[PDB]
Amino acid sequence: PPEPCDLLIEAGYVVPIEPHAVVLEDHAVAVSNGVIVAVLPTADARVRFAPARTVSRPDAALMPGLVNAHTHNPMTLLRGVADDLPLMVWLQQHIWPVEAAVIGPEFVADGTTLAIAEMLRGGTTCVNENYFFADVQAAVYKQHGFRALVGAVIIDFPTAWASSDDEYFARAGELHDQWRDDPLISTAFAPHAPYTVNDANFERVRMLADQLDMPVHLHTHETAQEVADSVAQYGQRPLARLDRLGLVNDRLIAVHMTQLTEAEIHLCAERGVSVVHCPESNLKLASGFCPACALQRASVNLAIGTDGCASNNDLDMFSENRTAAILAKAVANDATALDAATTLRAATLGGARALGFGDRIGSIEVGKQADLVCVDLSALETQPLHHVLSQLIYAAGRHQVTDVWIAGKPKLVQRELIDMDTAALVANARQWRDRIRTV
Amino acid sequence: PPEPCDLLIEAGYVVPIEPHAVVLEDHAVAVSNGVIVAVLPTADARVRFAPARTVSRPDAALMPGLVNAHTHNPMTLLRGVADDLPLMVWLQQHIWPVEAAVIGPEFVADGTTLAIAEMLRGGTTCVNENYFFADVQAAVYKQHGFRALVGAVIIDFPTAWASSDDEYFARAGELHDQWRDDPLISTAFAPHAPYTVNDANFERVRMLADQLDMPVHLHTHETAQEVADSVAQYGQRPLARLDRLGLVNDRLIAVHMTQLTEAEIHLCAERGVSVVHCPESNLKLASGFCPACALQRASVNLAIGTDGCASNNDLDMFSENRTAAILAKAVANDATALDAATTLRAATLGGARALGFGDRIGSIEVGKQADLVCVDLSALETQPLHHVLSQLIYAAGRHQVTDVWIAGKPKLVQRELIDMDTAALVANARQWRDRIRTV
Numbered sequence A, B: 001p002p003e004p005c006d007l008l009i010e011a012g013y014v015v016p017i018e019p020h021a022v023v024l025e026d027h028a029v030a031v032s033n034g035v036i037v038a039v040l041p042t043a044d045a046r047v048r049f050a051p052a053r054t055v056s057r058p059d060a061a062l063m064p065g066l067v068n069a070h071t072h073n074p075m076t077l078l079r080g081v082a083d084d085l086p087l088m089v090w091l092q093q094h095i096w097p098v099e100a101a102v103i104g105p106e107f108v109a110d111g112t113t114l115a116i117a118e119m120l121r122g123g124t125t126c127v128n129e130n131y132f133f134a135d136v137q138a139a140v141y142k143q144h145g146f147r148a149l150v151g152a153v154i155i156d157f158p159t160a161w162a163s164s165d166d167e168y169f170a171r172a173g174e175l176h177d178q179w180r181d182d183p184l185i186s187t188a189f190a191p192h193a194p195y196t197v198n199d200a201n202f203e204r205v206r207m208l209a210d211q212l213d214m215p216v217h218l219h220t221h222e223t224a225q226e227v228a229d230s231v232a233q234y235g236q237r238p239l240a241r242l243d244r245l246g247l248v249n250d251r252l253i254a255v256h257m258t259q260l261t262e263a264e265i266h267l268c269a270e271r272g273v274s275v276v277h278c279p280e281s282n283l284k285l286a287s288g289f290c291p292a293c294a295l296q297r298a299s300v301n302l303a304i305g306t307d308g309c310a311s312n313n314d315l316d317m318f319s320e321n322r323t324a325a326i327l328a329k330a331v332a333n334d335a336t337a338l339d340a341a342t343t344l345r346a347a348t349l350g351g352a353r354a355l356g357f358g359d360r361i362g363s364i365e366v367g368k369q370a371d372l373v374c375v376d377l378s379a380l381e382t383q384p385l386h387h388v389l390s391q392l393i394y395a396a397g398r399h400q401v402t403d404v405w406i407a408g409k410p411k412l413v414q415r416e417l418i419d420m421d422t423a424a425l426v427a428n429a430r431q432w433r434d435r436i437r438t439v
């Protein structure tokens, strides 16, 4: 007599991530109470289980949700607002003045919600969020059942979010207390950048991150000019200064990291630092060339993120992964750099580990949360199918995602979003388009 | 009383390419006998015309078909066959031996046909094809109503296509004679590479290309090792040798061009040479960094191509354009390089001009052929819509293409392919997958 479980998903291919470079043909995944309870051949699964419901996708690959390890998601409302302009013109004359005019709880809620639809439609199931009004974001992600590490911004300058150091840290503390032990939402400190966060604020982040047990999410070594300005002001590269401040350790999520030495690579490896690679943003802003292959081979935990929609301009992790994989080869002058399996690992388990969720998501293993994605591979764009891992990285587009679950709850069903209305989303986006136009 | 025309396409946005950087809101395009006969505000068009049929796409951008200016389209059957391997292992141990085993008219016809479906579904309407069995390819493109400049391969080594110099040139001559004055298919010489084509064969291409009035389609300066091997063998960089052979002129389509000097840039500008940029292939093979911004600002006609599906691994020109645009900024250390309008220009009119079709395709102007694409912009992935050109380059995915016409004939209608059956295409691709597996 079969054993009950809540859901059985049968697929043409299961890609567990752990073990590495393995593809399980004709396998199924059983789920109960949001948790993965079995991964096994589909014939073996049909004898073993009496699922309350079964989902069969014989043409699809089933893999863990992609983990977008660096977002500013309300900026979906600023999609393409200021393209093809140098960084300081982009920021000073476009991004900051628009943000100043529009940032508040409504803007953050609507932009985050728009991002959640875009992320689900493209098979992303978790984010490492970095934006003002983190309180609203956490609530929005939680309401939609979407997984997130939500950062509390710390910066030396006043904004609508907080006008003083004490206020930024009071908000951070409130965010952490509200979300302690939540299964979907965790919290992090997000000091903005080495050039916008003073030594005293960095010291306070170090102390509170240890006290409250939170990661530290930091834009680091993103540009040549950042490194040079740091030498002028502090006599030291930023990583050297952060090291002396006590911020280079197994809590640090270092984003961008385009300007780097070997010492620094092994520094990151020894201390347990994660690097988030955002290649499309880096290329588009002319920030430089993160040595992703060097970091990966030095055993630095590597994740992949998109950054925001004013410098990408999409949240497409399938694209981001492909860009990471092909750029890594050219930068390293080495065609074996960041192979398909390794890149897919970074996009799932690498991101999971960077956000401190490594034990709960990122691979299809018994006991982990059922954050899962079906990618249709029967589309002619992904045929013939010589190698499934190759196909997911170098040929599949994000529109081939057909089904998405987060903690076993259906979020996208045959390309349809559950409890979201795309028409209302689009109408809301047009309002914001008009408001920004007046600024 | 209204004036008759065959077809009126009404769209939310018309992007004519000529004039540059212009977007016509709420405009229509009238077409008769496959030719564009008017471009004008939709209200003005409804009073003027009595179309036999009208297509209304109020949420869409209408633009010229994308021109993929470098393909090896039968290699769609080799999609992902050998990823993450260095160039000489890729070629010698995988690509050449598989091609040797499978190349023939059936393989070329099936692979080309597969590519035509993928290209149409992604809004590509013209190719610059470079493969064995060009006779079969020309016939296949013509049968599907798909525009192509089809190259006759010239190479010093025997293959199933031709076993001697005389045979390669006899085939080339036959191809040209069969397709003279065809409105859809034109022909070019395709000497393979400087290192596979001897001086005598290059001389023969120069003479026949002038005599028969054909372009010359040549992989040029693709790799460091190509340039160095040339210095060893000929005492000269390859462009210097081709210059002395008389091949650097207004017939040359130079593909890849990753290894380049300034002299060479101005050389190309002075002589009317077109460069085809294939960024994704270049990055994936670690070939290097074509100075696309440098070439464009030096007035070198620049086009964009995908190369083949064993080194991309898709035929996605929306992606290729985005990669070209963002890579150009990082390579040039200049965020204003290859802006959205300029990149879109390269993808349409630049390709048109590279293939010698500049007077017939590449912009929405009266008198040109009605090769047109509707891109749905109402998808949330492309909202809010702050700038249409930005959106087409940095956010739109190829699955947002909804309708495609070539010479005014519908090829893709609401994502449905006309006179193609995707299921048969997929079944055929699986056969080839099995055959290759045995090699």
Ligand SMILES: [Mg+2]
Pocket (backbone or CB within 6 Å): A280, A312, A313, A314, A315, A316, A319, A320
């Ligand atoms: Mg992107």
Ligand SMILES: [Mg+2]
Pocket (backbone or CB within 6 Å): B280, B312, B313, B314, B315, B316, B319, B320
């Ligand atoms: Mg591609």
Ligand SMILES: [Zn+2]
Pocket (backbone or CB within 6 Å): A176, A180, A211, A212, A213, A214
């Ligand atoms: Zn805590």
Ligand SMILES: [Zn+2]
Pocket (backbone or CB within 6 Å): A281, A307, A308, A311
């Ligand atoms: Zn950024």
Ligand SMILES: [Zn+2]
Pocket (backbone or CB within 6 Å): A070, A071, A072, A130, A219, A255, A307, A308
């Ligand atoms: Zn950022």
Ligand SMILES: [Zn+2]
Pocket (backbone or CB within 6 Å): B176, B180, B211, B212, B213, B214
């Ligand atoms: Zn002729």
Ligand SMILES: [Zn+2]
Pocket (backbone or CB within 6 Å): B281, B307, B308, B311
């Ligand atoms: Zn190639």
Ligand SMILES: [Zn+2]
Pocket (backbone or CB within 6 Å): B070, B071, B072, B130, B219, B255, B307, B308
């Ligand atoms: Zn090629």
